[PDB]
RNA sequence: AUCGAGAGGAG
DNA sequence: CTCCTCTCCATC
């Protein structure tokens, strides 16, 4: 369910980063590694918040009313 | 009065072995007062060790064997939980019988 | 459901002042101060700072249970010098030390670029 | 769900033990603790 | 209230026996041959090593609450480098006409072995140890 | 729980400030105590941990598949070239003090699972309450504000203590206790209770 | 085209099987001390080879990372704790009406996955977060 | 087998001795064999030992056994307990089993025996045979919900 | 994602758990205990599929 | 000039990387503690969902709003809601906020943090602005909406401190290292062969002298020089984060000083 | 029947059981405002009171001890020694 | 059986338990909730009216209050409702059902109920958070762990009843237990891995720390102990202050294999008068040992003093370990490269040995041992050739482990672990078994259909050559998978008997008890035993003490 | 009231 | 023919 704001163990706002993470994954061909670093995510706690998150909302939305 | 002696007999030969003259002078050098104290409290120490009329021994013994029983889980003999099961049952049909001639 | 409220960590309650003071029975010139609604953030602080003062024999703190914010600072000191001052003098020392740390940091924050 | 849909019970030799022929038909690890231990098995 | 033994010892082995800070030091007494000493020295804050000479004092004086120093204005019997505090446990007849005391400097241990160290080297709680030079 | 049968319960909740922390400022989400490791052989658990670190850093899939050429000596090299010490350890600092830790610590991402059984759907007390019909004893479950069974086996442990009155308190006052009238001749309960 | 056939346990009784279909039947012609020790090619007839041995595992147990480095009954324990471990159980949980239904606020896929964890759809409807853990004594709580 | 044993000089010293350990029990006949010490020969058959050497030798083999099961696990139980268990078995005459046919039929109160295994049948024959039950047992007072002859209720308080 | 091997009955889903049973039409031999005059027995559960 | 010295190597909008000289460990720490947990901030504390046909449930959303960064620059001249004498809100304590979003489009409409509308009296001060550090200028995904789904509500941001909830932290991650080569010998390295090759030298080893083997242990040594670096979520800008630390610390230090007097 | 103030074995010492039910039996009186037969030096618990009445041997209670043959013995709480 | 001899009952509660290393041994951290719920009927007596009328006014849901006030005529006055609940003047002799209060007696147990010890009196300590908290050294006798074991609390209801917990069942009284005439609580995990760590020579704690630790013990005498070190720096030994917790007149004599009043391996244990002289404290000293400091302190000083002790040792070592701290990595299960090489060649010469017996036995020269089959004397040889391979490869693992090795350190401490745990985790795992025999032929004359028939080598009958950190292989996995499970079977079954046995054993001795003539009789009056235990001694007050009248020289006895 | 599954701890 | 517990389902 959606990208968490802020990362549980460290505190860095990670919310804004999601939609960003996706493009420099796939717009300008980059490997998930380097993408987490361009986004300022240097700590692994604060890297794992994004590397792992499965955006289940997109699939939630697929339902109708 | 005869069980009284018998019931103490073991404790005494200890007592003797330790509070015998040459030792209570040489190895550990007591003094009339000090000694007389060692003697004094040993009586009141013993006294406190006697079983209290009431002590519910039935359960007490049983649990005390029934517990270590549960600590058992895994040289060709029936041991452990299943042996106990023979022993308590007066096993007519004992799986490993075995003489041990001397 | 049994949880204690999260503001009970810095607010005080009722008929609960932020310092209790009491004389330690065991030693002479000895005092055990109970801090309501505080912890290591400034228990450890005063204690080591109540240590650089040469007129102090003894100085320790302890959070009885990390369940409630209350630590006990016990202090014994030299013949004469009442510990109530010992605490003061140290509590102040800190104020200055930090007071200086602020400006000094201010100075150097204004040197940098970006 | 994935597992509960693939479960194998057995009613009532040594039937709970993991047997050589179970190799790659029954899961060696997956079976419930106590009660019906091993008697139920997963594919 | 005084000073209870003295001599200059000759260290014959250092023992780093699975410890970094604490060493066991076996020594010998130059003066009278009827003497040897095993002692537990904190080689971290005072190194001890090869065929090395050092002086050993005991004393028993200069007890409710240890003060801090301030002693940068006091008397210390500090003319020494290394000085620990102990309790004495068993005093043993090696045999003879020979004697030996044992010591626990809070677990750092000491064996001294001689004779003239009888009415001198006492029985009690008191017992410091001052090494130097 | 972890992923290798390392079932635990929270015993205490610490804030970010009383937590130990690495020199890069990371607090840990979880302190499991290293007494749990060596009496249930769970070596994987530890391995997972080390690979994960490297996965969280290399921004990669951790490859934990069963039969592979995936080595602890393989994994560890990888996180040497990364910046940490090739076996997970990270110098941490105590939280109250900020004094260094006398001994390094194992740290890492580690898939953890929050299982059912949470304290509050369990906590049950009863001080008198609803009885059943048949025997006016208190009723099963905590679903019913029931009562707790002081079954035979515990009574044994009450007989052992030589607790006489107290075993009576369980076996009369709380639970049953009933007042029946009995015959001075026959000895049954045929007595008429015309009380008043 | 018959490159794979379905063998039942009784027919199993009369075959020679290969764990790996690669380093199992090539030519025999250094040994990185860290790689576990597998026996040898020993046996010459091989009727049919194994697809991949991980597939001897169930649906709960293949969710375990490195089950092969673990003490067996532990694996088993997981295997019964995976079926009590909270998460996204179905995408439609908003519309279904079930006596009791749990889901995870921000369920993360694990960081270390299985190659089986793929058809298991697990890394898409995870049950658990990827928390940093300190293993150490602290307050002894 | 080893044997720690007195020297004339005095010191107990280890002297090894050959033992025969068998895989089959007959004790009426192996001891009566010449060549072997018939003051030590021992079976793990504590039922046979009872038929041969007397109730009182049984009491021992039965301990020795009970003990030796507990002690192979490392567990030490303090003698007074097994010595109670082992006794209750021995005391009636032979080997009274720790099961329904042993203790749970032996002329005790009815209400008690009742609260173990064959519940009704005891109560049945209890009614047919006019058994006047004692209420000196524990259970007989748990049944009746009463302050029973135990630790606290052994004695009796007065003014 | 619902792969669905169940039925619905009274709303609640229901799963039929695969049952286990020794098969028929074999044909086995069972070494029987000593206090049995019966030594070996060749058993065969016979039913038509 | 008089005591605690402080160099700063690198400074930025979000990082205060600085040495800190001539100080006790005791406080150097208690700085980090307060910094992390005790300098007050503003962040949504009441939420009044009006209509919510999202797939994210009500309390889910009411949670992330919590976590959102709201400008806490002038926060010092705002009152703790508990303290102030109005019942519930007033402009002196509380800043309100509106969020209305409604699926207007086919192509999944977001709700970023930037369409939180301030509704209360700002009274001039600097407060309650969703900090945008986003490039495209819309930090924090709140939730996503479908075609015909809306979400309307009121947020009532209040003064709070991390001790009362981590949402109120303004500090993110504070780095803290002291004595890079272990010359204090406060740790004992765990090794298999070298210890030296087995752990890597911290970037902090350049600014401090190596040991030299020929030197024996310096026993009387203490902890000077701490190599901190403060990060900043960014409700409070990087500088004040350290400062407000030194102050609030100083504050309670003094409140305990006053206490003795008030008895 | 009866057993005389003489010819008494019976342990002169107080059984841990005997003693606990003495403490109890007084505590049940002290909890229902029956008079305290010692000076209560600032204690208020009817259990902790009894423990002083016992330290000072001022409890007007007897033990009746039953021997399993149906005989019995009387023991005043001032007569028994309180060791343990 | 289900209704009369064990009833459901009131005034009871039940919850998950958790660890609390700053509770007292006898204390029971009870959640506020549960404390708000259970009630003790207290009376209106001049000694309480004050504190009591207060409670009435407090309310049946602010903690130190109550529900229900009971009167003369004998009725319920229900304090949640009722128009008069902020009034009620209390008249002497009315009972006032009160909330369970701090420091009350309670019966607190874990099940299965298999001592008089998984069952005992406790001191109540009302607390937040809905878990039942108990001290980690009342762990052993309930058989607890805090991984979600639940526990049951009962509350007395009569003054006399309260007493019957307080005097008999009190946890400190149960410290030295009749079962094994030895104490059943001790020093456990963190504490125990600390108490050793703290204590080894090398470990020196100085002023700042020492000052706190001293204060940390609540029974401190306020005198900084004179430091063992006073020289270029002053320091106290680990031992030094730990000794602050040790009471007075407490002495201990141990002596291990290499112990010689110097203990050059810091072996044995010598404690003189509340201070410790030499010797590393660990399981054998501080544990639940026979000779243990706990066994001494309890006899010598009392229960009370010993139930205080537990805390102080903990409260301290806990503190020291809070600031030192220790962990465990996979690196603590690694072994050196020339060890790892040597381990494999230790298996690989044992691999020859099996092969060569199987070489022998195939060529009909394997001499049949007496009374056993040839096939058996093969089976026997290999299984002994394969245990001795793992045990030796294990000892090679243990020897390579440096003293900085955490796993070692817990094993040295006796906190958790063993030799086998090293050996599997680092060297090899060893042979699996299924009903005592190596892995069986499930398939016809072969193990898995990946093998040939007629193969009796180790590889094929379930010898797991690889270590746990190396990672087993598929065959291997399955094999260990077979053995693992054998445990579980009886963990589901070697229980169902062991519960039926206890059930009888109890029922059959049940009502046997010492009477008022030291005789041991039962309900019938039939003597079982003429003095209890053959000497009329409670086993609690009994100690293993040598009899130096027996062994040793006819000569040495004279002299 | 009655049946029946699935779990929890001792592995 | 192991204690104790939780929770959900279907019924004359
Ligand atoms: Zn983070
Ligand atoms: Zn009648
Ligand atoms: Zn306001």
CB J115 within 8 A of CB J133: no
**Cis amide linkage into residue L112, ω under 30° from 0:** yes
Closest residue by Cα to residue A56 from J144, G84, J66, J60 = J144
Helix, strand, coil abundance in chain C, percent, nearest 5: 30, 20, 45
Check L45 against K23: CB less than 8 A apart.
no
DSSP class per residue in L487-530: HHHHHTTTTTTHHHHHHHHHHHHTT-EE-TTS-EE-TT--EEES
Interatomic CA distance for residues J45 and L267, integer angstroms = 61
Q: Residue L78 corresponds to which tokens in the numbers above?
A: 């229900």
Checking chain B for breaks where C and the next N are over 2.5 Å apart, the residues before them are: 74
Ligand at shortest distance from the CA of F56: 1
Contacts of J19 (CB under 8 A, 6+ apart): J6, J7, J8, J9, J207, J225, J226, J227, J228
End-to-end CA distance of chain E: 24
Q: How far is the CA of L9 from the C1' of M10 (A)?
A: 24
CB B90 within 8 A of CB H29: no
> How far does the centroid of ligand 1 lie from the alpha carbon of residue F55, in Å?
15
Q: Which fold has domain J1-40+167-263?
A: Gyrase A; domain 2 (3.30.1360)
Contacts of H102 (CB under 8 A, 6+ apart): B90, H89, H96, L508
Residue E69 CB-density burial (10 A; 0-12 exposed, 13-18 middle, 19+ buried): exposed
I19 forms beta bridges with D9
Q: State the span(s) of chain J assigned CATH 3.30.1360.10.
A: 1-40+167-263
Q: What is the CATH number of the domain that holds F137?
A: 3.90.1800.10
Answer left, alpha or beta for residue J158, where phi above 0 means left and psi between -120 and 50 means alpha.
Answer: beta
**Structural element, H or E, at residue L8:** strand L8-9
- Which domains does chain E carry? 1-133 (2.40.50.140)
Interatomic CA distance for residues L97 and L82, integer angstroms = 16
Contacts of L527 (CB under 8 A, 6+ apart): H91, L519, L520, L521
Statement: the CB of D17 is under 7 Å from strand M: no
Alpha helices by DSSP H, listed for chain G, are: 9-12, 72-81
Q: Can you say which residues of J are annotated as belonging to the binding site for Zn(2+)?
A: 84, 86, 90, 93
Cβ count near L202 (within 10 Å): 18
Q: How far is the CA of F53 from the C1' of M8 (A)?
A: 33
> How far does the centroid of ligand 2 lie from the alpha carbon of residue L1, in Å?
29
Per-residue burial over F85-103, b = 16 or more CB atoms within 10 Å of its CB, e = otherwise: bbbbbbbbbbbbbbbbbbb
Cβ count near L246 (within 10 Å): 22
Q: Which of F153, F154, F156 to mutate to test the interface with B (most CBs of B within 10 A)?
A: F156
Q: Which fold has domain J41-166?
A: RNA Polymerase Alpha Subunit; Chain A, domain 2 (2.170.120)
∠ CA G64-G66-G69, nearest 5°, is 125
Closest residue by Cα to residue B98 from H23, H64, H33, H26 = H23
Q: Please give the C-alpha separations between residue J47 and each of F80, F142, L46, in angstroms, as whole numbers.
A: 47, 35, 53
Q: Can you say which residues of F are annotated as belonging to the binding site for Zn(2+)?
A: 183, 186
Interatomic CA distance for residues J26 and J4, integer angstroms = 13
Instruction: Return the beta strands (E) in chain K as ranges.
Output: 62-67, 71-76
Q: Can you say which residues of A are annotated as belonging to the binding site?
A: 7, 10, 45-46
DSSP L326: -
Q: Please give the C-alpha separations between residue L452 and each of G16, G43, G44, H150, L456, in angstroms, as whole numbers.
A: 7, 7, 10, 69, 10
CB K54 within 8 A of CB K47: no
CB H115 within 8 A of CB L1: yes
Residue J127 CB-density burial (10 A; 0-12 exposed, 13-18 middle, 19+ buried): buried
Interatomic CA distance for residues J190 and F104, integer angstroms = 7
Q: What is the CATH number of the domain that holds C28?
A: 3.30.1360.10
Interface of F with J (CB under 8 A): 15-17, 21, 23-26, 83-86, 89, 91, 93, 97-104
Checking chain H for breaks where C and the next N are over 2.5 Å apart, the residues before them are: none
DSSP L235: B
Contacts of F185 (CB under 8 A, 6+ apart): none
What CA dihedral angle connects L197, L203, L205 and L206, to 10 degrees? 180
Closest residue by Cα to residue F104 from H37, L238, L324 = L324
Ligand at shortest distance from the CA of J91: 3
Give the rounded distance of the alpha carbon of L275 from its chain centre. Answer: 26
Give the rounded distance of the alpha carbon of L413 from its chain centre. Answer: 14
Instruction: Give the count of domains, chain K.
Output: 1
Cβ count near L431 (within 10 Å): 21
**Structural element, H or E, at residue J25:** helix J25-37
CB A18 within 8 A of CB A7: no
Residue L326 CB-density burial (10 A; 0-12 exposed, 13-18 middle, 19+ buried): buried
Nucleotide nearest to F142 (CA to C1'): N6
Interatomic CA distance for residues L406 and L404, integer angstroms = 6
- Which domains does chain A carry? 1-65 (1.10.10.60)
Solved using: X-ray
Q: How far is the CA of H88 from the C1' of N1 (A)?
A: 24
CB F109 within 8 A of CB F46: no
Q: Residue K69 corresponds to which tokens in the numbers above?
A: 């043959």
CB F12 within 8 A of CB J161: no
Check F17 against J202: CB less than 8 A apart.
no
Q: Hey, which residues 45-64 in chain A have their CB within 8 Å of chain G?
A: 45, 48, 51-54, 56, 59-60, 62-63
Residue L476 CB-density burial (10 A; 0-12 exposed, 13-18 middle, 19+ buried): buried
Interatomic CA distance for residues L121 and F160, integer angstroms = 13
Q: Which residues touch strand N (CB under 7 A)?
A: D 34; F 121-122, 124, 140-143, 146, 148-149, 151-154; G 99-100; H 117; I 9-10, 12; L 6, 8, 14, 111-113, 150, 492-493, 495-496, 499-500, 503
C77 forms beta bridges with C56
Q: Residue L196 corresponds to which tokens in the numbers above?
A: 């050793």
End-to-end CA distance of chain G: 62
Interatomic CA distance for residues J122 and F124, integer angstroms = 50
Alpha helices by DSSP H, listed for L230-373, are: 238-245, 283-286, 293-300, 303-323, 337-348, 350-362
Interatomic CA distance for residues G25 and J246, integer angstroms = 71
Q: How far is the CA of B71 from the C1' of M5 (A)?
A: 32
> How far does the centroid of ligand 1 lie from the alpha carbon of residue F25, in Å?
9
Q: Select the residue of E19, E89, E102 nearest L201 (Cβ to Cβ).
A: E19
Q: Please give the C-alpha separations between residue D13 and each of B83, D19, F75, G52, L480, in angstroms, as whole numbers.
A: 21, 12, 46, 32, 21
Statement: the CB of G81 is under 7 Å from strand M: yes
Q: What is the CATH number of the domain that holds K84?
A: 3.90.940.10
Q: Does any CB of chain L come closer than 8 Å to the CB of residue B11?
A: yes
CB K18 within 8 A of CB K64: no
Q: Residue D41 corresponds to which tokens in the numbers above?
A: 């098995």
Cβ count near L13 (within 10 Å): 27
DSSP three-state, residue H61: helix
Q: Which domain holds residue F153?
A: 131-196
Closest residue by Cα to residue G16 from D28, L448, D18 = L448
Q: State the span(s) of chain J assigned CATH 2.170.120.12.
A: 41-166
Q: What is the CA radius of gyration of chain G?
A: 21
Q: Residue E102 corresponds to which tokens in the numbers above?
A: 């044992």
Q: How far is the CA of L495 from the C1' of M6 (A)?
A: 22
Helix, strand, coil abundance in chain F, percent, nearest 5: 20, 15, 65
Per-residue burial over H68-95, b = 16 or more CB atoms within 10 Å of its CB, e = otherwise: ebbeebebbbbbbbbbbbbbbbbeeeeb
CB F126 within 8 A of CB F146: yes
Q: Select the residue of G126, G131, G132 nearest A54 (Cβ to Cβ).
A: G126
Closest residue by Cα to residue L287 from L152, L165, L196 = L196
Interatomic CA distance for residues L412 and L193, integer angstroms = 9
DSSP B37: H
Nucleotide nearest to F40 (CA to C1'): M11
∠ CA E50-E54-E60, nearest 5°, is 140
Check B54 against F161: CB less than 8 A apart.
no
Q: Which domain holds residue K25?
A: 1-84
């Amino acid at each position: 369910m959606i990208v968490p704001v802020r990362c549980f163990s460290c505190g860095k706002v990670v919310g804004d980063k999601w939609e960003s993470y996706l493009n420099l994954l796939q717009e300008d061909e980059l490997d998930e590694g380097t993408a987490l670093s361009r986004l300022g995510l240097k700590r692994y706690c604060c890297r794992r918040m994004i590397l792992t998150h499965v955006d289940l909302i997109e699939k939630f939305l697929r339902y109708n009313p | 009065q005869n069980a009284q002696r018998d019931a103490v007999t073991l404790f005494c030969c200890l007592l003797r072995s330790r509070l015998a003259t040459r030792r209570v002078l040489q190895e550990y050098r007591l003094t009339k007062q000090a000694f007389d104290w060692v003697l004094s409290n040993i009586e009141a120490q013993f006294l406190r060790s006697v079983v209290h009329p009431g002590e519910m021994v039935g359960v007490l013994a049983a649990q005390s064997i029934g517990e270590p029983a549960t600590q058992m889980t895994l040289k060709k003999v029936t041991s452990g939980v299943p042996r106990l099961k023979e022993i308590l049952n007066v096993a007519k049909n004992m799986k490993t019988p075995s003489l041990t001639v001397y | 459901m049994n949880a204690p409220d999260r503001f009970e960590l810095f607010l005080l309650g009722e008929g609960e002042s932020k310092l209790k003071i009491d004389p330690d029975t065991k030693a002479p010139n000895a005092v055990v101060i109970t801090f309501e609604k505080e912890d290591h953030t400034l228990g450890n602080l005063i204690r080591a700072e109540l240590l650089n003062d040469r007129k102090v024999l003894f100085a320790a703190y302890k959070v009885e249970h990390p369940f409630f914010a209350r630590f006990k600072l016990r202090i014994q000191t030299t013949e004469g010098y009442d510990p109530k001052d010992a605490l003061k003098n140290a509590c102040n020392s800190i104020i200055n030390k930090l007071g200086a740390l602020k400006t000094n940091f201010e100075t150097e924050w204004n040197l940098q670029t970006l | 769900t994935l597992s509960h849909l693939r479960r194998t019970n057995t009613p009532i030799a040594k039937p709970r033990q993991l047997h050589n022929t179970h190799w790659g038909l029954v899961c060696p690890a997956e079976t419930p603790e106590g009660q019906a231990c091993g008697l139920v098995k997963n594919l | 209230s005084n000073t209870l033994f003295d001599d200059i010892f000759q260290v014959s082995e250092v023992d780093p026996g699975r410890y970094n800070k604490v060493c066991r030091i076996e020594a010998a007494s130059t003066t009278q041959d009827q003497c040897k000493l095993t002692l537990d020295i904190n080689v971290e804050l005072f190194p001890v090593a090869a065929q090395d000479s050092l002086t050993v004092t005991i004393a028993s004086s200069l007890t409710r609450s240890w003060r801090p120093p301030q002693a940068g204005d006091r008397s210390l019997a500090d003319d020494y480098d290394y000085v620990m505090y102990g309790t004495a446990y068993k005093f043993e007849e090696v045999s003879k006409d020979l004697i030996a005391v044992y010591y626990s400097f809070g677990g750092l241990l000491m064996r001294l072995e001689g004779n003239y160290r009888n009415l001198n080297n006492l029985k009690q709680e008191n017992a410091y140890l001052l090494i130097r030079r | 729980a972890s992923r290798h049968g390392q079932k635990g319960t929270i015993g205490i909740t610490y804030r970010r400030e009383d937590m130990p922390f690495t020199a890069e400022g990371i607090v840990p989400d979880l302190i499991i105590n290293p007494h749990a490791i060596p009496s249930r052989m769970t070596v994987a658990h530890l391995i997972e941990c080390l690979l994960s670190k490297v996965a969280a850093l290399s921004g990669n899939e951790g490859d934990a598949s069963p039969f592979t050429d995936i080595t602890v000596e393989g994994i560890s090299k990888l996180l040497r070239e990364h910046g940490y010490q090739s076996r997970g350890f990270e110098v941490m600092y105590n939280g109250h003090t900020g004094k260094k830790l006398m001994a390094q610590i194992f740290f890492g991402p580690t898939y953890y699972q929050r299982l059912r059984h949470m304290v509050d759907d369990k906590i049950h007390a009863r001080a008198r309450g609803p009885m059943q019909v048949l025997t006016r004893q208190p009723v099963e479950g905590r679903s019913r504000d029931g009562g707790l069974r002081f079954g035979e086996m515990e009574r044994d442990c009450m007989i052992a203590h030589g607790a006489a009155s107290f075993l009576k308190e369980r076996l009369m006052e709380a639970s049953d206790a009933f007042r029946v009238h009995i015959c001075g001749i026959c000895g049954l309960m045929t007595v008429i209770a015309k009380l008043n | 085209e018959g490159l794979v056939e379905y063998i039942d346990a009784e027919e199993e009784e009369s075959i020679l099987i290969a764990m790996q279909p690669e380093d199992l039947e090539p030519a025999e012609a250094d040994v990185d001390p860290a790689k576990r020790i597998r026996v040898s090619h020993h046996a010459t007839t091989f009727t049919h080879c194994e697809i991949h041995p991980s597939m001897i595992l169930g649906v709960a147990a293949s969710i375990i990372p490195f089950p092969d480095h673990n003490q067996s009954p532990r694996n088993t324990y997981q295997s019964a704790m995976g079926k009590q471990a909270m998460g996204v159980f179905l995408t439609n949980y908003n519309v279904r009406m079930d006596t009791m239904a749990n889901i995870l606020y921000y369920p993360q896929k694990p960081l270390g996955t299985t190659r089986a964890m793929e058809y298991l759809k697990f890394r898409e409807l995870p049950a658990g977060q990827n928390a940093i853990v300190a293993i150490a004594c602290y307050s002894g709580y | 087998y080893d044997r720690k044993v007195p020297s004339p000089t005095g010191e107990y010293v280890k002297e090894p001795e050959w033992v025969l350990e068998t895989d089959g029990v007959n004790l009426s006949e192996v001891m009566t064999v010449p060549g072997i010490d018939p003051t030590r020969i021992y079976t793990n058959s504590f039922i046979d030992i009872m038929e041969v050497l007397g109730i009182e030798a049984g009491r021992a083999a039965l301990y020795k056994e009970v003990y030796n099961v507990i002690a192979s696990d490392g567990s030490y139980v303090n003698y007074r307990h097994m010595a109670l268990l082992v006794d209750v078995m021995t005391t009636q005459g032979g080997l009274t089993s720790v099961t329904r046919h042993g203790f749970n039929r032996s002329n005790t109160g009815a209400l008690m025996r009742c609260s173990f295994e064959e519940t009704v049948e005891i109560l049945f024959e209890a009614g047919a045979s006019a058994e006047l039950d004692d209420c000196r047992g524990v259970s007989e007072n748990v049944i009746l919900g009463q302050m029973a002859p135990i630790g606290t209720g052994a004695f009796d308080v007065m003014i | 994602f619902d792969m669905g091997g169940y039925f619905i009955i009274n709303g609640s889903e229901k799963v039929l758990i695969a049952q286990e049973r020794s098969a028929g039409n074999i044909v086995q031999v069972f070494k029987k205990a000593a206090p049995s005059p019966i030594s070996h027995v060749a058993e065969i559960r016979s039913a038509l599929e | 000039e008089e005591g605690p010295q402080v160099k700063i190597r690198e400074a930025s909008k979000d990082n205060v990387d600085f040495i800190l000289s001539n100080v006790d460990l005791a406080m150097a720490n208690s700085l980090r503690r307060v910094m992390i947990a005790e300098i007050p901030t503003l962040a949504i504390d009441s939420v009044e969902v009006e209509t919510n046909t999202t797939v994210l449930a009500d309390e889910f959303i009411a949670h992330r709003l919590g976590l959102i960064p709201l400008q806490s620059m002038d926060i010092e001249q705002l009152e703790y809601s508990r303290d102030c004498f109005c019942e519930d809100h007033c402009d002196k304590c509380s800043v309100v906020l509106t969020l209305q979003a409604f699926g207007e489009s086919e192509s999944t409409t977001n709700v970023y943090s930037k369409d939180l509308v301030i509704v209360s009296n700002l009274m001039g001060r600097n407060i309650g602005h969703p900090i945008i550090q986003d490039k495209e200028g819309n930090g924090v995904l709140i939730c996503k909406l479908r075609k015909g789904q809306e979400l309307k509500l009121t947020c009532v941001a209040k003064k709070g401190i991390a001790k009362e909830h981590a949402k109120w932290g303004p500090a993110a991650a504070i780095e803290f290292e002291y004595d890079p080569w272990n010359k204090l010998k406060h740790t004992d390295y765990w090794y298999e062969q070298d210890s030296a090759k087995e752990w890597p030298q911290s970037k902090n080893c350049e600014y401090e002298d190596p040991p030299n083997e020929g030197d024996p242990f310096d026993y009387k040594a203490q902890a000077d020089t701490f190599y901190m670096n403060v990060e900043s979520v960014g409700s409070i800008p990087v500088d004040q984060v350290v400062v407000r630390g030194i102050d609030t610390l100083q504050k309670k230090v003094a409140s305990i000083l006053l206490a003795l007097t008030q008895m | 029947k009866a057993i005389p103030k003489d010819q008494r074995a019976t342990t002169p010492y107080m059984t841990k059981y005997e003693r606990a039910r003495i403490l109890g039996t007084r505590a049940l009186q002290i909890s229902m405002n029956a008079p305290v037969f010692v000076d209560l030096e600032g204690e208020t618990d009817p259990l902790r009171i009894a423990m002083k009445e016992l330290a000072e041997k001022k409890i007007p209670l007897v033990i009746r001890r039953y021997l399993p043959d149906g005989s019995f013995e009387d023991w005043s709480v001032e007569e028994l020694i309180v060791d343990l | 059986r289900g209704n009369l001899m064990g009833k459901r009952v009131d005034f009871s509660a039940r919850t998950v338990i958790s660890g609390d290393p700053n509770l007292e041994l006898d204390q029971v951290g009870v959640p506020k909730s549960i404390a708000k719920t259970l009630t003790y009927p207290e009376v209106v007596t001049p000694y309480n009216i004050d504190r009591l009328t207060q409670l009435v006014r407090n309310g049946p849901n602010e903690h130190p209050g109550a529900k229900y006030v009971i009167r003369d005529s004998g009725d319920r006055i229900d304090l949640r409702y009722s128009k008069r609940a902020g009034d009620i003047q209390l008249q002497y002799g009315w009972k006032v059902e009160r909330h369970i209060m701090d420091n009350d007696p309670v019966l607190f147990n874990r099940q299965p109920s298999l001592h008089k010890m998984s069952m005992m009196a406790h001191r109540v300590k009302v607390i937040p958070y809905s878990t039942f908290r108990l001290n980690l050294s009342v762990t052993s006798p309930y058989n607890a762990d805090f991984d979600g074991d639940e526990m049951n609390l009962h509350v007395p209801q009569s003054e006399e009843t309260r007493a019957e917990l307080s005097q008999l069942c009190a946890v400190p009284l149960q410290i030295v237990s009749p079962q094994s005439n030895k104490p059943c609580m001790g020093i456990v995990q963190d504490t125990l891995c600390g108490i050793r760590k703290l204590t080894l020579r090398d470990t020196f704690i100085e002023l700042d720390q020492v000052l706190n630790m001293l204060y940390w013990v609540p029974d401190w005498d306020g005198v900084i102990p004179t430091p063992a070190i006073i020289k270029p720096k002053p320091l106290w030994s680990g031992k030094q202050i730990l000794s602050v917790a040790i009471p007075n007149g407490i002495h201990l004599q141990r002596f291990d294999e290499g112990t010689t009043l110097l203990s050059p391996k810091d072996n044995g244990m010598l404690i003189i008068d509340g201070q410790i002289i030499f010797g590393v404290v660990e399981k054998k000293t501080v544990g639940s040992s026979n000779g243990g400091l706990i066994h001494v302190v309890t006899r010598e000083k009392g229960p009370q003093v010993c139930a205080k002790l537990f805390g102080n040792i903990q409260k301290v070592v806990n503190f020291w370990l809070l600031h030192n701290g220790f962990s465990t990595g996979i690196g603590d299960t690694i072994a050196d490269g020339p060890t790892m090489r040597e381990i494999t060649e230790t298996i690989a010469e044992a691999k020859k040995k099996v092969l060569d017996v199987t070489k022998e036995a195939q060529a009909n020269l394997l001499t049949a041992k007496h009374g056993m089959t040839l096939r058996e004397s093969f089976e026997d040889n290999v299984v002994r050739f394969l245990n001795e391979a793992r045990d030796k490869a294990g000892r090679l693992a243990e020897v390579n482990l440096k003293d900085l090795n955490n796993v070692k350190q817990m094993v040295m401490a006796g906190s958790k672990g063993s030799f086998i745990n090293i050996a599997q985790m680092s060297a090899c795992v060893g042979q699996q078994s299924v009903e005592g025999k190596r892995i069986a032929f499930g398939f016809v004359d072969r193990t898995l259909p990946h093998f040939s028939k007629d193969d009796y080598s180790p590889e094929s009958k379930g010898f797991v050559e690889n270590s746990y950190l190396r990672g087993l292989t598929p065959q291997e996995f399955f094999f260990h998978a077979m053995g693992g499970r054998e445990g579980l079977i009886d963990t589901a079954v070697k229980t169902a008997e062991t519960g039926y046995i206890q059930r009888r054993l109890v029922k059959a001795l049940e009502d046997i008890m010492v009477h008022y003539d030291n005789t041991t009789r039962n309900s019938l009056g039939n003597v079982i035993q003429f003095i209890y235990g053959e000497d009329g001694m409670d086993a609690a007050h009994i100690e293993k003490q040598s009899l130096d009248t027996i062994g040793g020289s006819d000569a040495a006895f004279e002299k």
